[PDB]
Structures are given as structure tokens and as C-alpha cells.
Design a protein around this ligand. Structure first.
Ligand SMILES: [Mg+2]
Ligand SMILES: [Mg+2]
Length: 307
């Protein structure tokens, strides 16, 4: 069998509470959070059940993906390497390790289904540049995978189950909100398809699930002076309630693949505060994490990229 590296890339998460400072410093481009922000972040992580389980999900995704790829075809043996943006093991570290280990051919995938210039393209460029610097190692990079039918089906089936679970008055008066991580609006300068891809995800999932009433929102914007993609899910939820009185909101954060702070806090707390305030029911179906159905979707994405 031919040996190939499987470079799995993601933002990263802290491994313990004491990593919060450096992780958020990295996110904030060298700006250390002030003490009240540091305490606030610690509190948020405690509220969602702790930090330890978060980074384990990414590891489990990469490992299960490796094992599943190796089991479903007989031509290639994959070895997974994790490369993260904001904490060790960094993308450049992972590529250098691949080269050290004698890998000469790799395929990469970012654990975010929509292409953007800000994240996916930047991860892919960084990986390819380090390979070029070392020589003798090439990388083929998945750019997007939101339209993989098996992935669409994951979310459609979760959404169906959620609607099926609702009392009758909710089921005929619910709103589905599909979201991803906000990015600066200025990505539009380069024709970034990120927003169009989120809207297509939303269309595909709503259509597959038989949901006629849905909306697209953004969440978890950072803090810079230039505008970020909106509307934010908190504002969208309240606006849609005021205009049409929905009694239940279903949140599908399709941009995210795991139980991390952006979902467990930015949906399950921040959006839940809003639905609680307006008297609506809150639902947010299970994230993919490292579940077999999702791992099969990822495996299919990778093998399609290789033909
Ligand atoms: Mg494509
Ligand atoms: Mg926020």
C-alpha cells in the first residue's frame, strides 16, 4: 500500500485552564486578555463542563478518520497528523514532523466545512509553504466539503429528529437558524465564497429536512474596528421573534464540527438566554464530534479529493 500523511487542521482549543491566557493571546494577535476577561473566560469554560473534553474531540476525530480511511479502502495507508492554528501542535510543526517521519505525499482537510480566505485558505497556504521550505513533500488540500451529501445528511437527519420531538404547536411554529463563525466583512473584497457557502448549507439542510421556515446567521465574531458578518444569531433570533412570533428555535451551527465554546456557550448559553427571554423553546441538535456517520462523511471527502 502507498503511505500518505493525513494532515487534519483546526483552530485548536486549550488543553487545561492555564492554557486560556496564551490561547486567547494568540487569537487576539499578541494582545493578552486583561484580568477581568481572563476570569470571564475561565468561568465560561467551567459553565460548559470544563476544558479537558474539548481538545480530546479533535484528537478523536483525526484518529477515527485515519482508522476508518484505512479500513474502507485497500490502496493507501494513512497516518494522521494534527496541525492547529492557535496552540501546539502548530500546522508548521505537523508538516515538519511528517517530513521527519519520511512522508512524501499528504492530503489535508480542515475541520470546518466552508471555504474562506481567512481560515481554510490560510491554513492550507501555511502547510504548503512549510512543505516547500523542507522540500520533498507535497500536499493536496481539501478546500471545502459542506456539500458532501453524507455531511448534509448528518444534519438533515438530526434536524428531522428534533422537529419530530416537538409538541404539535411548536412544530408548526418553529424557526431553524443555521450558522457559522462570523468573519470580517472585508473578505468580500476578494470574492470570498464563505457567506454563499453557509447559505447553500442552510438551503441544503432545510430542503433535506422538509423545513420551510429557516434563516442564516453568524456567531462568535471577534472584536476589531471593521465590521463582521451579520446578523449575529442573538439579534436574528430576537428580530425573527418580534416579526413573526415563533415558539421554538432550532440552532444548527453547521460551521462547527464539535462541542467547543462557540457552540456550548455561544449557542447553548447566549442564544438560550434570548429564547428564554422571549418564552420560546430552545433546541440545538448534537454536533458531529467523532461519531461514525460524520467520520464516514470525512473519509468520503478525502477519497473523492484523491479521485
Ligand atoms: Mg467543492
Ligand atoms: Mg461573543
Amino acid at each position: 500500500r502507498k503511505k500518505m500523511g493525513l494532515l487534519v487542521m483546526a483552530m485548536g482549543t486549550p488543553y487545561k485552564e492555564e492554557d486560556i491566557e496564551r490561547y486567547y493571546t494568540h487569537i487576539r494577535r499578541g494582545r493578552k486578555p486583561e484580568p477581568e476577561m481572563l476570569q470571564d473566560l475561565k468561568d465560561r469554560y467551567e459553565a460548559i463542563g470544563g476544558i479537558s473534553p474539548l481538545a480530546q474531540i479533535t484528537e478523536q476525530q483525526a484518529h477515527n478518520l485515519e482508522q476508518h480511511l484505512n479500513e474502507i479502502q485497500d490502496e493507501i495507508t494513512f497516518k494522521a497528523y494534527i496541525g492547529l492554528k492557535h496552540i501546539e501542535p502548530f500546522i508548521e510543526d505537523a508538516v515538519a514532523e511528517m517530513h521527519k517521519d519520511g512522508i512524501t505525499e499528504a492530503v489535508s482537510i480542515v475541520l470546518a466545512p466552508h471555504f474562506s480566505t481567512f481560515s481554510v485558505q490560510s491554513y492550507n497556504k501555511r502547510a504548503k509553504e512549510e512543505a516547500e521550505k523542507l522540500g520533498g513533500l507535497t500536499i493536496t488540500s481539501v478546500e471545502s466539503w459542506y456539500d458532501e451529501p453524507k455531511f448534509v445528511t448528518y444534519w438533515v437527519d438530526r434536524v428531522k429528529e428534533t422537529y419530530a420531538s416537538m409538541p404539535e404547536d411548536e412544530r408548526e411554529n418553529a424557526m431553524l437558524i443555521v450558522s457559522a463563525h462570523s468573519l470580517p466583512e472585508k473578505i468580500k473584497e476578494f470574492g470570498d465564497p464563505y457567506p454563499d457557502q453557509l447559505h447553500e448549507s442552510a438551503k441544503l439542510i432545510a430542503e433535506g429536512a422538509g423545513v420551510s421556515e429557516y434563516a442564516v446567521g453568524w456567531q462568535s465574531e471577534g472584536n476589531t474596528p471593521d465590521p463582521w458578518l451579520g446578523p449575529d444569531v442573538q439579534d436574528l433570533t430576537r428580530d425573527l421573534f418580534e416579526q413573526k412570533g415563533y415558539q421554538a428555535f432550532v440552532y444548527v451551527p453547521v460551521g462547527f464540527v464539535a462541542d467547543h465554546l462557540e457552540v456550548l456557550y455561544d449557542n447553548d448559553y447566549e442564544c438560550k438566554v434570548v429564547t428564554d427571554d422571549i418564552g420560546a423553546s430552545y433546541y440545538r441538535p448534537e454536533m458531529p464530534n467523532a461519531k461514525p456517520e460524520f467520520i464516514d462523511a470525512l473519509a468520503t471527502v478525502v477519497l473523492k479529493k484523491l479521485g
